[PDB]
Design a protein around this nucleic acid. Sequence first.
RNA 1: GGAGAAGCAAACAUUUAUUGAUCCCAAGAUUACCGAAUGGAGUAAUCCAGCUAGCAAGAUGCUAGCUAUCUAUUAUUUAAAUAAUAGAGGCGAUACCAGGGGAAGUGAACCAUCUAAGUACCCUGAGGAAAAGAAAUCAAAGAGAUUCCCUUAGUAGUGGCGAGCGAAAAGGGAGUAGCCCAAACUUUAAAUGUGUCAAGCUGCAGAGCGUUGCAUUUAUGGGGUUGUAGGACGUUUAGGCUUAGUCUGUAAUAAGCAAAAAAGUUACAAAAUAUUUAUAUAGAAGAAUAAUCUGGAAAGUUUAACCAAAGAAGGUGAUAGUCCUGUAAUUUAAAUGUAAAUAUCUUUUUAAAAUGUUCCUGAGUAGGACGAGGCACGAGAAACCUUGUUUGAAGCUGGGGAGACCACUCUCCAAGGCUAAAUACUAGAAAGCUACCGAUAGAGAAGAGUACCGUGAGGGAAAGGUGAAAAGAACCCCGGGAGGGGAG
RNA 2: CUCUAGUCUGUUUAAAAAGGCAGGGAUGAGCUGUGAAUAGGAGUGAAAGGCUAAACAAACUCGGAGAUAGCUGGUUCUCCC
RNA 3: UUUGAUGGAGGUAUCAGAAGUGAGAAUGCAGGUAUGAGUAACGAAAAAAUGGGUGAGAUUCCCAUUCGCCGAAAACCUAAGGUUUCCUGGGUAAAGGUCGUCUUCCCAGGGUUAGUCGGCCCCUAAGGCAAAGCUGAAAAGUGUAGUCGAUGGGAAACGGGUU
RNA 4: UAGGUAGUCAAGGUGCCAAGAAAUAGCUUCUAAGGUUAGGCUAUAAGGGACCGUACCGCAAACCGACACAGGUAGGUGGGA
Lengths: 98, 65, 101, 91
Amino acid sequence: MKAYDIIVSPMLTEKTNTQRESINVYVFKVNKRANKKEVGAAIKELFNVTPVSCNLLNIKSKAKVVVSRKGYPIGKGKTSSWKKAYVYLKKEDKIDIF
Amino acid sequence: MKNFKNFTLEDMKAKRLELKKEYLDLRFKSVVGHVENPLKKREIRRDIARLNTMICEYELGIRKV
Amino acid sequence: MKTKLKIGDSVKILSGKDRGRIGKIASINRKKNKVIVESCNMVKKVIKARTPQEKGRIIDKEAAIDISNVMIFVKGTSSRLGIRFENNEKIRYLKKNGQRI
Amino acid sequence: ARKCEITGKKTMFGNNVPRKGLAKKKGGAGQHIGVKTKRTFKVNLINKKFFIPNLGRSVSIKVSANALRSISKIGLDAFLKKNCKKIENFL
RNA sequence: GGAGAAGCAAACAUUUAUUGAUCCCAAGAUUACCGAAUGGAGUAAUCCAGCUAGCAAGAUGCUAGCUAUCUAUUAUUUAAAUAAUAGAGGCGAUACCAGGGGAAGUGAACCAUCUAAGUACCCUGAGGAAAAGAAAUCAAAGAGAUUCCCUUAGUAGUGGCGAGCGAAAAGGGAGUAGCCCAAACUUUAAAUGUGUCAAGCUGCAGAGCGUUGCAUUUAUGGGGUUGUAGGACGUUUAGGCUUAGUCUGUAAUAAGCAAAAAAGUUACAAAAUAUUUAUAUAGAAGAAUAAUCUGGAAAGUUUAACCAAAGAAGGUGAUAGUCCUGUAAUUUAAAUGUAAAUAUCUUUUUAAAAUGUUCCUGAGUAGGACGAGGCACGAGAAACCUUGUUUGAAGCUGGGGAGACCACUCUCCAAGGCUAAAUACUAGAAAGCUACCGAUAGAGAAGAGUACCGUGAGGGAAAGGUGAAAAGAACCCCGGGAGGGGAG
RNA sequence: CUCUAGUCUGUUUAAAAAGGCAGGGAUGAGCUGUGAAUAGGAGUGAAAGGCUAAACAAACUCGGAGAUAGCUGGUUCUCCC
RNA sequence: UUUGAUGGAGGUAUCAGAAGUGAGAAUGCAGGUAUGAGUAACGAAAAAAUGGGUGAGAUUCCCAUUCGCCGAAAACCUAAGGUUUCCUGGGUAAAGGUCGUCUUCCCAGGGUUAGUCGGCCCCUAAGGCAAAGCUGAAAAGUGUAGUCGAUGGGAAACGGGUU
RNA sequence: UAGGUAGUCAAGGUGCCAAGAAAUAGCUUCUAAGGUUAGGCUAUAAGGGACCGUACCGCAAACCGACACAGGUAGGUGGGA
């Protein structure tokens, strides 16, 4: 898996924004098959900077209840689960694309 | 559907790399919030798949240069 | 589904409100087998177009007529359509007389 | 199983049939069948040892007394050949 | 195939498509992980490796490719051990077939015989059919493999002779097809035993004393398959020659070569194309209506046509042969799949009509004793077949059968192995039909084995319809809304 | 922390077996968490014909099965003799 | 079978044929709705009250001041389980035994960062599978070498702060 | 400062009989086939952290009782008089 199938997209959220402003942390949606090592390697190849460390989380799928055309519960649907990555850079390092 | 139906193997490889650049940057801009042509994602993805088959055909020898 | 009418033709409306009124084909919904004839089957419609509250308004627009209710009309004649093979071209002609469309 | 390793004989299932009365060929009015039950007739396998000088060693086979009799009549090699088995399948 | 497409329904704003899209068919690529799951292990969708290649490879890094087991065949002392290929594992058909296991509820107004019944079900096997299949048979008629129907026939028999169970032959049909091994002899040897003389050879002579001398087993070819014919011996023969019928040279025979016939549906095996407007899997063309009246809407009312190998069935604003799609009769095949036919290819005979002496013609087999089952037939006079425990033959100068048995007579020739078709079955695929259903009906399910219930096995619902078209009620009034009253 | 004599509420209850008062055990034949083993003519039972997924003088599910009943119930429009 | 209202799209004479051919009950089945009845309850005898704010609407929401209750808990921190019920914002068809501006209700968005924790891992208890061997109609049953199997045994961290 | 609960010292000590897990792990050590920087130990400097769970409820309207039910519900904290 090339370093392009690893990183999916960043996250722009209030929590991630404050974290990035304060302690220089970048949060990405990554592929569920990645791990710490190739996430770090992918960050290096993509943005030409080596991260100090990486943390990964598995976000479970959010369940929804599906109702009929009239509308009344007939089953349980679910969103897609995904993997979230916190990436820690050196205090001088930056990522510009954001 | 773009036209690569005359490209050589390594030219196709270079095309694949810069199209992967384009797809990654497009995803990033979409998340940042405003991209005028969301379907560009689908178009680029299909292009990359085309390149993957065509290259594969080169190694498999089905399509000869 | 399959049909022998082309967008842009001029057709005469067989049945409906608009007897024999002749108009151009603007669009064809072949999922429902319906056709939109310009300035025919002309209905009043209301649109808000969005929930924010500047204004909404009444506009006039054509409604899709069924395919079966129109018939090609060229040079003062309306008739069925057959097709012929000449010059390696699937061309169309009028069953009543047999001319180039 | 209780299976002759040469021929393939296996146990045979049948009935258990009691009879009351006296057979007509003994002057009796006849016989009457009672309550039949299920039963099995068992092959009498023997775990025999045949010493084979041809490789100077003894091979142990599960054979029935019938197969032993036939081996005594015809010879072990020929009997194995007739039932399309080979001595090396044993050991 | 031609103008839209972005699934199954549109919506909201983004592109693509005449550079031939979408879609349909054929083929190929990609094809995560689990699962027969097979590197080990495991709480199925996941941790742990061995080895090799590339990632600065590296500190439990990533990716690619191998190492599971059984059976058959040999590379070896096929057991042990690895190696080599070949065939299998599981699912599917809540169908069919074969083999093994085999009830119980009932009837007999009880029940124990019997019946139900080889039924349900379990288990082992494969196939598209399976099984069976070319008479040691039916059976007293002159027939002639096996299987499936109509009759025989509810007959013949059987049955605590109670209830019940229940043929076969012949005849008339569907459908057709007969064959190949072992053994008798011989060649090529090998292995294992035994053997130092007159042991091989068609017969005179010379050579010859071991062409391995004689046997068994393994492997190869010839030889042959039955109311007792095939081989060794009896001749015409033997197309014709080359080689040799222990070696050379002759009467005298085999091994090869002209000449022919068949063959992957049994009968030897492995294919490959051309070739068949043959077929399966995408398609193309396709006939013949105007007016008038009612009505929102005509296809209908009425007045006149036209087509028809097409008045089958749907949709079209109310009821269409001629409005649209289709329908009759025709017809698209690059590629793929399935079929025959033709040669190619493969294999075989490269000979038959012909008399008597010897050899073989299927061995723990036929049969008998005891204990069981299948035959319609429950020990009954109980044949016959299979079969467990025992015993045990003949060798055509023979044996089996002809419902106990004996004699005669008439038939047949087992103890080796195959065989298409007629026949069973439809989960399904396509094309069609119905005095079949129209939402409490019809599959449980027009929305699905979902919701729900139970730890699990498992059980299991209810809910179809606006209008011809959303053309979904702008705007205004009451009300927080909902909703209603107006306006459209 | 584990058990239920006696009494009462409750009994179309809050609970398809509790609660309100009380009592026995309370360093032991003790209580209990977390895994595992024994399955139907069988298991288990300091033994009452108890229990084995709220029902056990032979569990439950599926199939035979629409089992058999001399027993009970039901059996739909009309007229004439 | 005639006239009307309603209804807006198929029925049907005569003759003949064929049945899933006629319901008032089976403690019948399915569905709707009466009856008891605006009656019993509205779920423990720990207890609420005032003022203010939000809101169209407040005895039941929020805030504040009093009172009351538990306090070897009715408190706090971790399992067994549940699986978004957690936080922010918006809303009240139903559902909450009433009301509701509120909720574990609904909609949208957001939220779980490990070398030191718990697993994974290297080990074994009971137990399970298990080549070979042995025993059985099949299916399997026994069982050795092995391999799995924690509530057990094994390397490493504490304090404070921040949303 | 004084007093001192509950651990802990302690798998201690002292007595008793019912005589009270295993380990192929870990730690330590030993030698074969093979090795003699091939390794290992004693240090320093540099960096290598696997994969998953991680919210919240958890004596309760969020678990198990058809319920927002007077029930069951493991373990560690257990203030003051």
